[PDB]
């Protein structure tokens, strides 16, 4: 039952990311962290499957997804900083001008 238990560990992290999106409509920083939780869960999936199949391709991709996650976080927080610097606040009511 090993494979199912590791899988459900990763799955709970993924669902927690989804819920964190669902539960933070005023908190866009936590939304970015929920996306990072989903990415972590996917990385875990790849590593667990690599072990389970005796195949190395899951580990190569896990390392590359690590690089991608780091780049995404750096750019994401830069955009957060310039959004805050322009507006003076992070409240969602100040980032809703574009619509229709």
């Amino acid at each position: 039952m090993d494979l199912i238990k590791y899988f459900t560990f990763s799955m709970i992290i993924f669902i927690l990311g989804i819920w964190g999106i669902l539960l933070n409509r005023r908190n866009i920083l936590i939304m970015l962290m929920s996306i990072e939780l989903m990415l972590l869960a996917v990385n875990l999936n790849f590593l667990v499957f690599s072990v389970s199949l005796d195949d190395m391709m899951g580990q190569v991709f896990a390392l590359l997804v690590l690089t991608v996650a780091a780049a995404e976080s750096a750019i994401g927080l830069a955009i957060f900083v310039i959004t805050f610097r322009v507006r003076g606040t992070i409240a969602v009511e100040f980032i809703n001008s574009i619509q229709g």
Binding site: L16, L29, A71
Partner: protein, 174 residues
């Protein structure tokens, strides 16, 4: 059992990432979720990935999150909302995703039920593979830079874009 302890720690720590009032605490609970993930990786025998999750996720990414969040001094009013009203929608979404994905492997990967018989005596050992064993580190390093070097280089291009975009978006030179 051990997997149950780690799963419970990660579940509570993740709830605290997505439910803490203070975003600094959220970033700190995220560090705990990454530590727990490192423990899981150690159980799978992948010690390189277990160390790298510590070095990159906690040592570098969480630090950046912490620096930004701490200097932002977010006020609790700008981000506060009551979440009792989302229990039904969270319930339906989470229940659909639970019933469908916590059991996606069950048809394909049927668990072996533990019997009251010693099945350890049927483990077949092949000593030929054990003469010169490879670590996780050198097994990965055998592939990254030769058979799959193009993806390695594309990842470098991704990092270059991150450096350029960070400078261009935020730099105000004195």
């Amino acid at each position: 059992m051990i997997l149950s302890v780690l799963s419970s720690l990660a579940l509570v720590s993740g709830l605290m990432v997505v439910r803490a009032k203070n975003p600094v605490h959220s970033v700190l609970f995220f560090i705990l979720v990454f530590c727990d993930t490192s423990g899981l990786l150690l159980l799978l025998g992948l010690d390189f990935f277990a160390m790298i999750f510590l070095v990159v996720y906690i040592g570098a990414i969480a630090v950046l999150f912490l620096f930004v969040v701490m200097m932002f001094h977010i006020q609790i009013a700008e981000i506060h909302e009551e979440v009792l009203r989302y229990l039904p929608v969270s319930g339906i979404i989470g229940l659909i995703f639970w019933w469908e994905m916590f059991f996606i492997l069950d048809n394909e990967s049927i668990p072996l039920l533990p019997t009251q018989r010693n099945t350890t005596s049927l483990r077949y050992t092949v000593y030929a593979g054990k003469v010169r064993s490879w670590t996780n580190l050198e097994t990965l390093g055998n592939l990254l830079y030769t058979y799959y070097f193009v993806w390695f280089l594309v990842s470098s291009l991704i990092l270059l874009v991150a450096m350029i975009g960070a400078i261009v978006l935020t730099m105000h030179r004195t």
